[PDB]
Amino acid sequence: MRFWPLDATYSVVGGVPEVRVFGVDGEGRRVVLVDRRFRPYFYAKCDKCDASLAKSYLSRVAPVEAVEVVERRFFGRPTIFLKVVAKVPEDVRKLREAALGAPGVVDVYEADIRYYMRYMIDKGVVPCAWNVVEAREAGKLGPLPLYEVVEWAGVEEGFPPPLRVLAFDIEVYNERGSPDPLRDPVVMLAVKTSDGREEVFEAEGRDDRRVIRGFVDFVKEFDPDVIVGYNSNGFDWPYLSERAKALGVPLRVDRLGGVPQQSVYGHWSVVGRANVDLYNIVDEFPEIKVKTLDRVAEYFGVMKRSERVLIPGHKVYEYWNDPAKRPTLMRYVLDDVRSTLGLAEKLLPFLIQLSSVSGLPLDQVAAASVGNRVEWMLLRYAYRMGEVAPNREEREYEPYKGAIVLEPKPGLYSDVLVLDFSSMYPNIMMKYNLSPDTYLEPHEPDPPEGVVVAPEVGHRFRKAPTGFIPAVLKHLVELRRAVREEAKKYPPDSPEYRLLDERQRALKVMANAMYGYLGWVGARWYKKEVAESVTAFARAILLDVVEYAKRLGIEVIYGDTDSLFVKKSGAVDRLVKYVEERHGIEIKVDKDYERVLFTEAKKRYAGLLRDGRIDIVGFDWCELAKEVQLNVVELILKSKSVGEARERVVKYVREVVERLKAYKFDLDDLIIWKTLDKELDEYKAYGPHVHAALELKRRGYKVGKGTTVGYVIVRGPGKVSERAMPYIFVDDASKVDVDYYIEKQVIPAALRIAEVLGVKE
Ligand SMILES: [Mg+2]
Ligand SMILES: [Mg+2]
Numbered sequence: 001m002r003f004w005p006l007d008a009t010y011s012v013v014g015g016v017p018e019v020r021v022f023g024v025d026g027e028g029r030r031v032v033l034v035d036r037r038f039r040p041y042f043y044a045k046c047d048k049c050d051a052s053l054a055k056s057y058l059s060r061v062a063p064v065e066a067v068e069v070v071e072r073r074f075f076g077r078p079t080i081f082l083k084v085v086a087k088v089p090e091d092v093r094k095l096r097e098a099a100l101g102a103p104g105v106v107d108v109y110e111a112d113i114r115y116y117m118r119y120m121i122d123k124g125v126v127p128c129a130w131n132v133v134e135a136r137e138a139g140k141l142g143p144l145p146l147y148e149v150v151e152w153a154g155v156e157e158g159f160p161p162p163l164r165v166l167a168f169d170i171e172v173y174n175e176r177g178s179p180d181p182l183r184d185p186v187v188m189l190a191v192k193t194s195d196g197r198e199e200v201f202e203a204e205g206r207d208d209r210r211v212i213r214g215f216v217d218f219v220k221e222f223d224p225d226v227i228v229g230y231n232s233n234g235f236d237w238p239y240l241s242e243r244a245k246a247l248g249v250p251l252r253v254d255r256l257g258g259v260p261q262q263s264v265y266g267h268w269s270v271v272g273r274a275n276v277d278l279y280n281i282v283d284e285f286p287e288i289k290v291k292t293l294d295r296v297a298e299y300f301g302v303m304k305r306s307e308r309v310l311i312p313g314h315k316v317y318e319y320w321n322d323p324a325k326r327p328t329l330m331r332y333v334l335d336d337v338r339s340t341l342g343l344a345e346k347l348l349p350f351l352i353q354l355s356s357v358s359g360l361p362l363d364q365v366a367a368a369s370v371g372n373r374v375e376w377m378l379l380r381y382a383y384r385m386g387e388v389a390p391n392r393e394e395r396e397y398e399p400y401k402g403a404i405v406l407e408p409k410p411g412l413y414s415d416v417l418v419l420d421f422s423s424m425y426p427n428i429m430m431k432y433n434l435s436p437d438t439y440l441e442p443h444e445p446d447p448p449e450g451v452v453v454a455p456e457v458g459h460r461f462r463k464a465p466t467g468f469i470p471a472v473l474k475h476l477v478e479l480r481r482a483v484r485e486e487a488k489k490y491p492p493d494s495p496e497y498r499l500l501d502e503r504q505r506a507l508k509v510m511a512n513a514m515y516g517y518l519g520w521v522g523a524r525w526y527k528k529e530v531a532e533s534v535t536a537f538a539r540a541i542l543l544d545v546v547e548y549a550k551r552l553g554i555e556v557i558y559g560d561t562d563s564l565f566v567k568k569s570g571a572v573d574r575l576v577k578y579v580e581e582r583h584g585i586e587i588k589v590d591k592d593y594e595r596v597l598f599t600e601a602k603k604r605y606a607g608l609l610r611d612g613r614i615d616i617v618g619f620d621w622c623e624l625a626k627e628v629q630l631n632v633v634e635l636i637l638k639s640k641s642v643g644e645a646r647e648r649v650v651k652y653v654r655e656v657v658e659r660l661k662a663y664k665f666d667l668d669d670l671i672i673w674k675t676l677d678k679e680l681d682e683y684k685a686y687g688p689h690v691h692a693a694l695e696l697k698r699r700g701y702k703v704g705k706g707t708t709v710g711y712v713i714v715r716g717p718g719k720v721s722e723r724a725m726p727y728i729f730v731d732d733a734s735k736v737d738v739d740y741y742i743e744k745q746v747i748p749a750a751l752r753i754a755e756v757l758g759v760k761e
């Protein structure tokens with residue numbers, strides 16, 4: 001049979017661990033494959049190898065299935081290990097620490113690999129890809145047909161089957177700032193489906209049993225394969241989980257009548273289906289700068305923010321207790337879920353391919369960090385190459401380290417092309433065979449095959465037998481090259497072409513992510529001399545391409561390790577064709593900006609695309625200050641010449657102050673948020689953040705953790721910052737300290753783009 005895995009789990013059925021894999025067989029029905037014979041294990045690097053002595057020693061701390069002697073590679077060198085095999089995954093920590101002792105071994109490896117990932121790696125199970133399985137049909141498991149796996153074969157090239165996708169959105173009462181699931185009810189919950197269905201379950205005035213019951217019944221009725229939400233792992237699932245407990249209605253949404261569990265990376269597992277949180281993947285997009293559902297929806301063109309209902313999120317209770325405002329609160333919820341499913345149609349095909357690459361399941365591929373995603377790929381490659389994985393220190397991850405090469409001049413630039421140099425790093429590492437296992441140390445016999453010296457960092461690498469990291473990149477390049485030519489078979493506007501284009505890009509992203517991973521100090525295959533050698537090779541040929549660009553009529557405004565910005569001309573085509581012929585690197589125009597504004601001498605800029613979209617790169621205001629930080633950027637980017645830019649900006653910054661002193665503001669725009677992450681009076685701040693969180697003790701009841709305050713400065717005699725009234729206590733007055741909001745933010749927000757203008761009235 002052909003299987004296509006969606007989700008993987010495991011249980012411990014009476015002292016024997018059992019792996020389950022849920023998927024979609026070749027005949028298009030949802031089944032579950034099971035394996036009871038696999039068992040967890042880890043390696044122990046022995047100086048003297050005695051498995052029987054080892055086994056009996058380890059048997060005192062936990063039960064041991066076996067202790068085998070294996071020969072595997074370690075940084076290329078073939079060494080001997082003890083393969084300690086536990087009976088159940090839970091005992092692996094006890095055996096890991098105990099092993100260390102009784103010097104047979106010196107170190108332990110691969111003891112922290114989660115069990116169901118261990119199984120798929122060792123058996124070659126690739127998620128979101130058709131696998132070949134010999135499997136006996138052995139009755140049902142719940143409603144699902146169960147199959148005992150005999151042996152896994154490989155994977156077959158083949159397109160994804162149709163999946164039942166369910167988008168869902170919620171809104172919670174929240175009359176008091178950040179809601180609490182113990183009493184605050186789930187007011188509305190919409191669902192939208194790939195079939196075309198939409199429904200909204202609304203509560204009865206402060207009672208939300210009907211809606212949780214309706215949500216659960218709908219999920220069971222529709223039986224979705226993927227559940228998509230926006231920040232569903234962050235808020236929705238944790239709230240519904242704890243709300244369903246308080247009301248005593250079970251949140252049984254998974255395929256075995258079970259409730260969601262919070263799991264790795266903070267993602268929420270729904271057994272037998274893929275719970276995808278789109279906010280996990282959009283956080284990685286550096287262009288968006290704000291990343292709310294409505295604004296991300298506009299960037300990807302699924303819903304125009306100006307053609308859409310928008311409620312100030314902090315006031316869903318107000319629209320709920322008002323029958324005039326309830327029908328518009330509904331359309332707000334519908335526009336949310338329609339955008340959520342809209343985003344999914346654009347992003348989910350990519351995530352499915354990024355899951356079959358790298359090898360993480362669909363519910364985890366986006367939740368994991370880029371380096372975490374790459375490391376699970378290298379573990380899969382390390383297995384089929386017979387290589388034992390090194391050990392880790394911690395996870396912090398650091399996205400990609402943009403080392404500046406050509407510092408820009410802060411100012412305005414028109415007609416700018418951004419050239420992508422990300423494919424440079426695999427080329428460098430393959431062509432020069434850079435890898436932890438190929439680096440040379442105070443032993444310097446140059447092997448007969450030869451050596452390559454990194455430009456004046458002076459590190460030496462073997463040309464020899466290809467290293468581990470180059471071998472992986474070589475395979476990724478080959479896979480993509482094969483997929484990319486198969487796309488020529490189909491016409492560019494076909495479903496079959498777009499699917500292949502997503503798979504092609506997914507391979508590219510994982511290949512180009514290597515460079516960021518190998519610099520991450522908390523990486524398994526981290527070696528400082530590799531990263532430094534990759535940069536030095538990278539810096540050397542960038543200076544070549546900037547010098548050759550000058551031989552053409554091409555101005556270079558900015559250039560760092562991963563990209564350089566150039567002025568749009570006909571000559572660019574020769575610069576790109578030069579880098580291919582000279583360096584063997586494929587360069588592509590990443591962005592075509594009509595105008596660009598560099599505020600500082602770093603990669604801090606805003607850019608105006610030809611279609612009109614602005615995107616902003618690089619880094620406690622009110623929402624009016626945010627509005628005027630935009631507009632100002634949009635006014636500068638749409639003005640020709642710098643002189644026009646001031647007169648446009650200063651007129652706008654004055655007109656806002658004019659209406660602000662004329663008392664025509666909406667109060668919502670004046671609220672200043674702060675989220676209160678820890679204890680009150682622990683870091684004794686003294687600011688308006690704490691003082692506003694003090695006036696809530698007359699009548700008010702809250703101080704606790706996880707609660708956003710929202711304050712407005714009001715006129716009156718007092719200390720600096722100590723006039724912060726909460727926004728519910730301005731009793732229809734609209735007498736606000738305007739001198740505060742003009743002087744220390746509305747002007748400074750515009751002055752954060754003051755590359756030409758000072759404080760003016
Ligand atoms: Mg939501
Ligand atoms: Mg899962």
Ligand SMILES: [Mg+2]
Nearest residue numbers: 171172174313
């Ligand atoms: Mg809310």
